[PDB]
Design a protein around this ligand. Structure first.
Ligand code: NDP
Ligand code: NDP
Ligand code: NDP
Ligand code: NDP
Ligand code: A1IXS
Ligand code: A1IXS
Ligand code: A1IXS
Lengths: 250, 248, 249, 250
């Protein structure tokens, strides 16, 4: 039968593009979402209209807490319940906002959301994916600009660096099980919905290759590569998909 | 007056060497401890005998919890109380143990991410908020990119500490606060580890087939806080005898 | 028309597998070689049997010298003379042998290891861009550049220089729509003459499957990078190393 | 007796500051120079006035050619001839100018100067230093911006990347002989003499720590540390001295 993938934060934007392209490649997909229930169910409907019984949704907060391990366990379980197997995990869900060091959320809430979604939830999902176990792999959505960070984003940056560490540590530890672990690191892709055009164009103008952001499809293309049989010897690699942005000095 | 430094996990091993060497350089010091009160006080006694009223201790658990922010606030405050200023923060305290992918997990998170990364972040915030040659030094790990098998959470925390080092260097540079790291390889081996397993690591090191002493680590800390490093920020100095250059 | 690609050192091993896969993808190919004329011609004949007039050979030494710029210009020109265009350059050719710090002269070692691994790539990149749609260059890098073999300093220098060229050229050619990327093998095809027992010491160190990459696995990453699936990727270097570079001493 | 150090390109700017500070620390110095004969001899005069017989000059072109190995051997030999020992090599000399990929020196000459001075000469000097062999060490002047390069500086960038490789490879290979090999990587320090003032201030304003370039002395300070007894377990390390410049995104 068809392989199955979990994509976290898959209702919109890049995570939707990944779920769609996995689906088009022939995967069955768990569309995880947190708040975006209408968007999630709408996507699942679309996919299921293309091939029936091939998409389900799964709701979970990926904020760190004492129940996050259970929630991550349940996301993986939802793939096995729906499809009988889980071949691919894409850790795409992410919180992203400033946490200035010199200063309504409390700091322990910021830590829970930015470190939880970007790093701890990927770790617990990886553990559950490996434990619940062909071409198995995990793809972590990283950030090409992790070493040239946005001013005042220390906790987000910490979380994305931790995710690089997970990608490496998990690639090493899971290789004996045949599970590959790799990352895709966008530079500027879909800009934040809240961002003004003028601010969007400032970012666009910085990109060497075309002076434009990555499309969601372009990000998903690299994910599709890493899960594919064309990447069978690739583990612990993080592919930047950034149009050269990370090479540009100040 | 004399400048003042906070050193976390300063009662034993690497943090003790750092505290001693800072003290010998003329800093007044806050010796932070969690469980090692006797050791902390013994060090303070040794330092105060050399120079009166130049060393104090500060207890705090650095596990992540609802109260870690307040604890980190207190460590920094205790420096300003004792000495009227705080010039240097050395984020040295660390938890280290395996967390296989295949203690509850959330306690492991609280220790290996809390003590290794979140507490540095909160201490950095408190240090900067409460503000010369000001600087922060984070104790990183030279083997971050070639990690020990089954140490994912530990490795995650040390990568996050790299991220903090860079992000805080950028954000605090406007305030004249430098932020740097020192990345040991094999130093004083964990007490638990066997001597045979220790020998195996020793032989792998290009420079002299031996571990770093704690004082070698402290030497790099001293450089980074000194006036000889006044343009250095966002740098992580490996002190590993070349171990990280060695392939499998 | 079908696009065209230059692959250096394409007679054997990895460069051969790259030229084959590019050809199977629909590229016309220039098969560059230095000493292996029989192998280069054999490959070109095999490809031309598959599709006529799609494969040519081009002989050149890529050792650093006064004449290397002209040689590199002529490699690129050969693709335009054969095929009327040059879409892809794969810098694959490489010299690889120890150069201890403490029977060729040292300046010959420099010329061969720095010329093949770095200088020739640079000169080919210049000739490629000057002669100019999905244009791209792929440089064969080395995943173990930061954990080098003992006594391989010149080889290691050349491969680090190649990383620099990949980044610098990606930034500089991005306005011309030319992407520049790398593929960094760990242990792939080992020497044929290397004892199986020595080959096994290497294979045992690879986390993923305790084996070396095939040439085809390396070529697969090249194919991705030149493909329309990599249209936003430039300045990136993809390790294809089975996790070898993650393993501590 | 006092230890001895070779500093390449030591007549002016950062190399001069390194030679001065090593001398101030107790070292006897070989002041290598290519064209700057007046300033070389003037510096050696100045140091010898401070302590007699503690400074010599040594002229050599570090452009790549079939005679560069002999020129490198001669630089090391000059230290032994003057001082009977050679404890420290500082690879500081450097050519630096644009070499655009797309179009009055020939390209052959641009390769010879930029790869010879920045990389090949360091390698051959390292070879000679090791072959002729307390607290021995080599310090290579690298570049903090090598992964965010100046546009059109490909050959310079290639040379500096090669120098990172040399720093690592030589640190591994020479560690058994008790020779440590490390790097110091400036960001913007003393700006080119050729450069206008508006352009200098543009670069200054990018530096997070102080919005100013490094002094030559601040670069030398890091060199002094790496050769010192306080760096005895440090090898294969490159210390950026860049005021945060390499952390700043486009
Ligand atoms: N866009 C860009 O330019 C870049 C993106 N990336 C990375 O690529 C990935 C995709 O980016 P993008 O599509 O912009 O991501 P978004 O910012 O759109 O976030 C994706 C999803 O994350 C989910 N999420 C947020 N917080 C939580 C939480 N507490 N619990 C569970 N889910 C949560 C949301 O699900 P819901 O809507 O259901 O609440 C959201 O739709 C991310 O990992 C991101 O960091 C990296 C660099 C640049
Ligand atoms: N040792 C080596 O070879 C290596 C060192 N490092 C880094 O070097 C630094 C120092 O290492 P080392 O001296 O061996 O450290 P240890 O592992 O011996 O621990 C240092 C101190 O940290 C404190 N600490 C640990 N957990 C907590 C906690 N939850 N709350 C509060 N304090 C805590 C302890 O203080 P107390 O005793 O008072 O409870 C402890 O003595 C660390 O940051 C480490 O990661 C990096 C890699 C290798
Ligand atoms: N195999 C592996 O495990 C690894 C490979 N790589 C890289 O992958 C690429 C392909 O590897 P592999 O197939 O093993 O390479 P080889 O060592 O087999 O060399 C490829 C070709 O390089 C050509 N070459 C050598 N010297 C010169 C020269 N002076 N002038 C012109 N051409 C020359 C030769 O052509 P001819 O036969 O015609 O003389 C040779 O067949 C290389 O860049 C290599 O560094 C990196 C890491 C590991
Ligand atoms: N200054 C800065 O902002 C930065 C500098 N650096 C690095 O730090 C080091 C010192 O920088 P800086 O003082 O600006 O260097 P300079 O550009 O001033 O060059 C140093 C010396 O190198 C010598 N040199 C040049 N070409 C040759 C050659 N063919 N043969 C022999 N010697 C030659 C010259 O000697 P002579 O005058 O005798 O002919 C020159 O005085 C260099 O390696 C540089 O790459 C790194 C990044 C930033
Ligand atoms: N979950 C998400 N993670 C990231 C990471 C990076 C980016 C990104 O680069 N966005 C454009 C640059 C940007 C966006 C917002 C601010 Br405020 C500053 C810069 C956007 C996102 S969305
Ligand atoms: N041209 C070549 N370069 C390299 C680099 C590494 C290896 C190897 O790891 N064996 C083999 C080769 S062959
Ligand atoms: N030999 C030299 N190397 C470099 C490297 C960088 C810079 C620089 O950033 N100038 C502004 C200047 C120089 S001069």
């Amino acid at each position: 039968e068809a392989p199955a993938a979990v994509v976290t934060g898959a209702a919109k934007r890049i995570g939707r593009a990944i779920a769609v392209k996995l689906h088009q490649t022939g995967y069955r997909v768990v569309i995880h979402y947190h708040n975006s229930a209408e968007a999630a169910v709408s996507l699942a409907d679309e996919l299921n209209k293309e091939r029936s019984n091939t998409a389900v949704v799964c709701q979970a907060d990926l904020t760190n807490s004492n129940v996050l391990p259970a929630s991550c366990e349940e996301i993986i379980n939802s793939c096995f319940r729906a499809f009988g197997r889980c071949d691919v995990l894409v850790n795409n869900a992410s919180a992203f906002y400033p946490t200035p060091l010199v200063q309504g959320k409390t700091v322990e809430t910021q830590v829970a959301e930015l470190i939880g979604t970007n790093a701890i939830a990927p770790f617990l999902l990886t553990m559950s994916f490996a434990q619940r176990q062909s071409n198995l792999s995990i793809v972590n959505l990283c950030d090409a600009m992790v070493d040239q960070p946005c001013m005042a984003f220390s906790l987000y940056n910490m979380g994305k660096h931790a995710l690089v560490g997970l990608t490496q540590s998990a690639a090493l530890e899971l290789a004996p099980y045949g599970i590959r672990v790799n990352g895709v690191a966008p530079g500027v892709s879909l800009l934040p919905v809240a961002m003004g055009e003028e601010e969007k164009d400032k970012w666009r103008r910085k990109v060497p290759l075309g002076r434009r952001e990555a499309s969601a499809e372009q990000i998903a293309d690299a994910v599709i590569f890493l899960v594919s049989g064309s990447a069978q010897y690739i583990t612990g690699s993080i592919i930047k998909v950034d149009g050269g942005l990370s090479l540009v000095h100040a």
